[PDB]
Write a protein that holds these residues in place. Structure first.
Motif, PDB file in Angstrom:
ATOM      1  N   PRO A  49      -5.975   3.664   3.437  1.00 12.30           N
ATOM      2  CA  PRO A  49      -6.514   4.751   2.615  1.00 12.30           C
ATOM      3  C   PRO A  49      -6.628   4.358   1.145  1.00 12.30           C
ATOM      4  CG  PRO A  49      -4.225   5.134   3.021  1.00 12.30           C
ATOM      5  CD  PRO A  49      -4.633   4.006   3.940  1.00 12.30           C
ATOM      6  N   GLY A  50      -7.828   4.500   0.593  1.00  9.72           N
ATOM      7  CA  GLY A  50      -8.049   4.148  -0.797  1.00  9.72           C
ATOM      8  C   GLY A  50      -8.078   2.646  -0.991  1.00  9.72           C
ATOM      9  N   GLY A  51      -9.278   2.072  -0.972  1.00 15.70           N
ATOM     10  CA  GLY A  51      -9.420   0.638  -1.145  1.00 15.70           C
ATOM     11  C   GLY A  51      -8.513   0.091  -2.229  1.00 15.70           C
ATOM     12  N   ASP A  52      -8.583   0.692  -3.412  1.00 15.85           N
ATOM     13  CA  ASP A  52      -7.763   0.270  -4.540  1.00 15.85           C
ATOM     14  C   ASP A  52      -6.368   0.868  -4.408  1.00 15.85           C
ATOM     15  OD1 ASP A  52     -10.603   0.074  -5.268  1.00 15.85           O
ATOM     16  OD2 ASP A  52      -9.863  -0.509  -7.252  1.00 15.85           O
ATOM     17  N   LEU A  53      -6.324   2.169  -4.134  1.00 17.58           N
ATOM     18  CA  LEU A  53      -5.072   2.897  -3.982  1.00 17.58           C
ATOM     19  C   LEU A  53      -4.099   2.162  -3.065  1.00 17.58           C
ATOM     20  CD1 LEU A  53      -6.829   6.284  -3.172  1.00 17.58           C
ATOM     21  CD2 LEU A  53      -6.781   5.031  -5.336  1.00 17.58           C
ATOM     22  N   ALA A  54      -4.620   1.619  -1.970  1.00 20.57           N
ATOM     23  CA  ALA A  54      -3.798   0.890  -1.010  1.00 20.57           C
ATOM     24  C   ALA A  54      -3.005  -0.211  -1.704  1.00 20.57           C
ATOM     25  CB  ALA A  54      -4.678   0.293   0.080  1.00 20.57           C
ATOM     26  N   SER A  55      -3.700  -1.035  -2.482  1.00 19.81           N
ATOM     27  CA  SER A  55      -3.059  -2.124  -3.210  1.00 19.81           C
ATOM     28  C   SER A  55      -1.986  -1.552  -4.128  1.00 19.81           C
ATOM     29  CB  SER A  55      -4.095  -2.890  -4.034  1.00 19.81           C
ATOM     30  OG  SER A  55      -5.125  -3.404  -3.206  1.00 19.81           O
ATOM     31  N   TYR A  56      -2.378  -0.580  -4.946  1.00 17.72           N
ATOM     32  CA  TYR A  56      -1.457   0.073  -5.867  1.00 17.72           C
ATOM     33  C   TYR A  56      -0.223   0.546  -5.111  1.00 17.72           C
ATOM     34  CZ  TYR A  56      -4.752   0.264  -9.796  1.00 17.72           C
ATOM     35  OH  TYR A  56      -5.584  -0.060 -10.843  1.00 17.72           O
ATOM     36  N   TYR A  57      -0.387   1.630  -4.363  1.00 18.92           N
ATOM     37  CA  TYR A  57       0.700   2.205  -3.585  1.00 18.92           C
ATOM     38  C   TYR A  57       0.779   1.485  -2.242  1.00 18.92           C
ATOM     39  CZ  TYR A  57       0.927   6.122  -6.928  1.00 18.92           C
ATOM     40  OH  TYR A  57       1.057   6.898  -8.056  1.00 18.92           O
ATOM     41  N   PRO A  58       1.834   0.681  -2.046  1.00 19.05           N
ATOM     42  CA  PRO A  58       2.085  -0.099  -0.830  1.00 19.05           C
ATOM     43  C   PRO A  58       2.138   0.706   0.462  1.00 19.05           C
ATOM     44  CG  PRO A  58       4.091   0.192  -2.035  1.00 19.05           C
ATOM     45  CD  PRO A  58       2.978   0.576  -2.967  1.00 19.05           C
ATOM     46  N   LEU A  59       2.906   1.790   0.454  1.00 18.98           N
ATOM     47  CA  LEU A  59       3.041   2.632   1.634  1.00 18.98           C
ATOM     48  C   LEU A  59       1.680   3.073   2.161  1.00 18.98           C
ATOM     49  CD1 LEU A  59       5.328   3.522   3.333  1.00 18.98           C
ATOM     50  CD2 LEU A  59       5.483   5.641   2.026  1.00 18.98           C
ATOM     51  N   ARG A  60       0.688   3.116   1.275  1.00 21.30           N
ATOM     52  CA  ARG A  60      -0.657   3.520   1.666  1.00 21.30           C
ATOM     53  C   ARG A  60      -1.253   2.508   2.640  1.00 21.30           C
ATOM     54  NH1 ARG A  60      -2.333   7.885  -1.641  1.00 21.30           N
ATOM     55  NH2 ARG A  60      -4.235   8.015  -0.365  1.00 21.30           N
ATOM     56  N   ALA A  61      -0.677   1.310   2.667  1.00 18.04           N
ATOM     57  CA  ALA A  61      -1.146   0.251   3.553  1.00 18.04           C
ATOM     58  C   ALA A  61      -0.176   0.048   4.711  1.00 18.04           C
ATOM     59  CB  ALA A  61      -1.305  -1.048   2.771  1.00 18.04           C
ATOM     60  N   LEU A  62       1.116   0.110   4.408  1.00 18.93           N
ATOM     61  CA  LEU A  62       2.155  -0.067   5.417  1.00 18.93           C
ATOM     62  C   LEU A  62       1.862   0.832   6.615  1.00 18.93           C
ATOM     63  CD1 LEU A  62       6.000   0.168   4.670  1.00 18.93           C
ATOM     64  CD2 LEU A  62       4.908   0.144   6.911  1.00 18.93           C
ATOM     65  N   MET A  63       1.288   2.000   6.345  1.00 24.77           N
ATOM     66  CA  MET A  63       0.952   2.952   7.396  1.00 24.77           C
ATOM     67  C   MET A  63      -0.306   2.496   8.124  1.00 24.77           C
ATOM     68  SD  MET A  63       1.687   6.686   5.421  1.00 24.77           S
ATOM     69  CE  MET A  63       3.533   7.040   4.990  1.00 24.77           C
ATOM     70  N   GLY A  64      -1.340   2.178   7.352  1.00 27.55           N
ATOM     71  CA  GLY A  64      -2.595   1.737   7.928  1.00 27.55           C
ATOM     72  C   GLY A  64      -2.456   0.620   8.944  1.00 27.55           C
ATOM     73  N   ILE A  65      -1.554  -0.319   8.682  1.00 21.87           N
ATOM     74  CA  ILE A  65      -1.344  -1.441   9.590  1.00 21.87           C
ATOM     75  C   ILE A  65      -0.494  -1.080  10.804  1.00 21.87           C
ATOM     76  CG2 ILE A  65      -1.720  -3.285   7.926  1.00 21.87           C
ATOM     77  CD1 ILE A  65       1.817  -2.236   8.850  1.00 21.87           C
ATOM     78  N   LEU A  66       0.370  -0.080  10.657  1.00 20.31           N
ATOM     79  CA  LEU A  66       1.228   0.342  11.759  1.00 20.31           C
ATOM     80  C   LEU A  66       0.469   1.211  12.757  1.00 20.31           C
ATOM     81  CD1 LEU A  66       4.661   1.251  10.116  1.00 20.31           C
ATOM     82  CD2 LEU A  66       4.279  -0.431  11.921  1.00 20.31           C
TER      83      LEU A  66
END
Ligand SMILES: [Zn+2]
Ligand SMILES: [Zn+2]
Ligand SMILES: [Zn+2]
Length: 766
Positions: free
Chosen positions: A538-555
């Motif tokens: 979620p959020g191309g840039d936001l993901a990088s900024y806020y880690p959890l925004r990616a940790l979820m996406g990959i899980l």
């Protein structure tokens, strides 16, 4: 006579060698001469006795000019038809030299009583001192340099003129009289002439912080010893974790201060005085504030008159030098701005007359397992070229973050100073000036096209366009990752070869946020190979900024909607986006993720590993550029028992997600560190192993790692090592940096090739 027709060639011509050969000759009273032909013709006929016929040839090696390394010496034997009463330098292609640090000799000269420049900050000989940072434009001459505003005093001229004296033709020469002078300020107010310097330091150790007018851009200073003040600085600058840069007195201090590598001590005492990063001693000496969650530390040694002298006083050795400018803005040159920007930032000021024309951030370098590569190309390098297998006058903007535009001609690319992050407008305009300057030492109406990252939104490519539309020059874009991988085969000078790309956020081809995949740089019809199963973030840039925004996406690629909820419970990183935004609500964004409504597809290794940094007790919200990747590495080091993971690799896709799976199944038993350390190697090993197999099923002898997440020693160690069961590979070295900064070089040798026609007009786009 009875001499020897010594024949040397390689670095002599261009650099200052004649002045050296002349001195070294007369010093040994060995009368002779040094002929000159051109890019390939400078011999020496030292006709004299024996007790000196050797000393000369013997010194030529250990005393040759800095920017020079003797390459050939053939002791011939020819008798002069006429003895030599006087030594002459009979003559008949100037090149902008970089900014060198004070020479070992000049040091003693100032740091000692007897001399005229006793404690003179602007000390310098014809074998060191500033250059590029103050070279108006070739021809390289006093009357055409920042030192022009300073008329030489009689005393100097006499030297400047005399050949025997080292200060011969030392354009940037001076003395306490005709040379510029220092001064002390404090958000205004000041003394006069030399009263400052001495006192200046008396404050740096006192506690307060003060900016210093470096040779290529002034920067804030502070006693890295006082944990109290150092922290203060991090507030007035709004910088929470970026690894500060410290400056120790002598190498010794660096030792007890941390870890000294072998060829490292060499890389340090280099004429470039870079900011290396070596592991800090287990029993941390300096305040843990200088840099948290990081085994390494920014180390710097004095580099120009004022430094050594300033170091004398202040008692405490270790200082702190960082780009004096709000987070996002480039260094401040004109003293004018110094006040109109840090009025609140710094406490005191120490500026001087000599204006610093071209900016030049300090070059930082860090060693890895395979060899020893850098990251920031500037400081003491620029404007030194790197060879390109193709000849074409052109410009190449490059990436947008940690950028560094370049320009080539005849077969050499020119990396600019660390133009920082092209984000803020402040930066953008900065590049324009830099390019203009560079272009003043080259050709106008560049007979060739331009180059830019394949991203139609970079403040960089932004220029490429308007610039292309200007002067009417063809434009050309190229994949970001295909660049980092190219920056290798350009520096190592070779042909098409497989390679591993691991960047944090690359504008991959086809709106694909790449950052983890191996490619084939086949001269003809290039194409992608391995890859990572794109994960939803979620959020191309936001993901990088806020880690959890990616940790979820990959899980989600391994767990269901409500499933992702439980797994996350393995830890508590919700209160993260709460200290800077809403918390629960973010987790609620899970809908946006589950429904697959608003989602961009990525494949960056930086993010992958990044999530692992939050799927643990490591780190949370990003505070700058590449905070997790680094924080996770350091933490990993503390691991001993290397666990055995094995991220799968099917066909041409890597179910990196499955990695996470097993990772969690080990948390209940396996130590915390051993996990970060294990996953590191695992992810890398199976990542490289692929590059290997592909090399064979494609007839390629070697591969090449490069890009953002390339400095990871743990990974770079395994990766490159895996290539031991194949052919000798190579990864960008000191010359060019694997990081983004050195992307332009990869672009130059890449796009420039397009012109050649050895590459399809579109196998760079699709
Ligand atoms: Zn010197
Ligand atoms: Zn003088
Ligand atoms: Zn990159």
């Amino acid at each position: 006579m009875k001499a020897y027709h010594i024949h040397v060639q390689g670095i002599v011509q261009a650099v200052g060698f004649r002045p050296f050969v002349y001195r070294i000759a007369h010093e040994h009273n060995l009368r002779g001469y040094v002929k000159n032909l051109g890019d390939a013709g400078v011999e020496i006929v030292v006709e004299g006795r024996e007790e000196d016929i050797e000393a000369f040839i013997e010194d030529l090696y250990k005393k040759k000019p800095p920017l020079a390394r003797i390459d050939r010496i053939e002791k011939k034997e020819i008798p002069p038809q006429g003895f030599d009463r006087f030594y002459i330098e009979k003559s008949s292609d100037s090149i902008i030299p970089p900014d060198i640090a004070i020479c070992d000799d000049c040091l003693r000269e100032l740091f000692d009583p007897t001399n005229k420049r006793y404690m003179y900050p602007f000390i310098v000989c014809t074998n060191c001192g500033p250059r590029f940072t103050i070279i108006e434009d070739l021809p390289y001459d006093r009357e055409n340099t920042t030192m022009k505003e300073f008329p030489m005093c009689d005393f100097c001229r006499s030297e400047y003129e005399d050949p025997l004296n080292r200060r011969y033709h030392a354009e940037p020469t001076a003395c306490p009289v005709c040379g510029p002078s220092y001064r002390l300020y404090t958000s205004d107010g000041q003394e006069i002439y030399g009263d400052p310097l001495r006192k200046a330091a008396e404050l740096i150790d006192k506690g307060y912080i003060v900016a210093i007018k470096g040779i290529g851009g002034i920067h804030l200073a502070c006693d890295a010893a006082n944990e109290e003040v150092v922290a203060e600085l991090r507030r007035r600058t709004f910088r929470p974790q970026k690894p500060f840069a410290i400056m120790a007195k002598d190498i010794e201090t660096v030792k007890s201060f941390a870890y000294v590598s072998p060829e490292e001590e060499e890389e340090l005492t280099s004429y470039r005085r870079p900011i290396i990063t070596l592991r800090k001693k287990e029993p941390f000496p300096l305040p843990e504030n200088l840099a948290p969650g990081l085994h390494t530390i920014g180390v710097m040694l004095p580099y120009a008159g004022t430094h050594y002298i300033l170091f004398h006083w202040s008692k405490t050795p270790v200082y702190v030098m960082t780009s004096a400018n709000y987070p996002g803005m480039p260094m401040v040159k004109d003293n004018e701005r110094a006040f109109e920007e840090l009025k609140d930032v710094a406490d005191y000021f120490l500026l001087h007359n000599r204006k610093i024309l071209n900016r030049a951030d300090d070059s930082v370098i860090r060693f890895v397992d395979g060899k020893r590569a850098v990251i920031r190309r500037s400081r003491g390098f620029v404007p030194l070229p790197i060879e390109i297998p193709f000849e074409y006058n052109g410009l190449a903007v490059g990436a947008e973050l940690m950028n560094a535009f370049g320009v080539a001609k005849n077969g050499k690319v020119y990396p600019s100073q660390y133009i920082g992050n092209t984000g803020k407008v402040e930066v953008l305009e900065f590049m324009r000036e830099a390019i203009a300057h560079f272009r003043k030492i080259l050709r106008v109406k560049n007979l060739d096209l331009i180059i830019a990252d394949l991203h139609p939104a970079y403040n960089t490519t932004k220029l490429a366009m308007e610039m292309a539309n200007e002067l009417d020059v063809e434009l050309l874009q190229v994949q970001h990752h295909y660049a980092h991988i190219a920056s290798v085969m350009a520096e190592k000078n070779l042909d098409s070869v497989i390679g591993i790309a691991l960047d944090g956020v690359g504008y991959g081809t086809d709106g694909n946020t790449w950052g983890g995949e191996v490619l084939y740089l086949g001269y003809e019809d290039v194409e992608r190979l391995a890859h990572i199963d794109y994960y939803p973030l979620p959020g191309g840039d936001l993901a990088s900024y806020y880690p959890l925004r990616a940790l979820m996406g990959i899980l989600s690629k391994v767990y269901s909607i409500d499933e992702l909820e439980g797994v996350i419970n393995r830890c508590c990183p919700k209160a993260v986006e709460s200290l800077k935004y809403g918390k629960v609500e973010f987790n609620v964004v899970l809908n946006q993720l589950a429904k697959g409504i608003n989602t961009a597809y990525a494949s960056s290794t930086g993010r992958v590993l990044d999530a692992i940094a939050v799927l643990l007790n490591v780190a949370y919200r990003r505070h700058y550029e590449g905070e997790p990747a680094m924080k996770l590495e350091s933490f990993a080091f503390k691991g001993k028992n290397d666990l055995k993971f094995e991220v799968p690799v099917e066909g041409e896709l890597i179910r990196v997600e499955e990695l996470f799976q097993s990772i969690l199944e080990a948390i209940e038993g396996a130590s915390p560190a051993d996990i970060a350390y294990s996953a590191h190697l695992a992810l890398a090993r199976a990542f490289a192993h692929t590059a290997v197999e592909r090399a064979r099923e494609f007839g390629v002898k070697n591969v090449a790692l490069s890009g953002g997440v390339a400095y990871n020693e743990l990974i770079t160690k395994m990766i490159r090592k895996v290539v031991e069961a194949n052919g000798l590979n190579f990864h960008v070295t000191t010359e060019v940096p694997r990081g983004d900064n050195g992307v332009n070089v990869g672009q130059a040798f890449l796009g420039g090739l397009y012109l050649e026609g050895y590459l399809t007009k579109e196998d760079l786009m699709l």
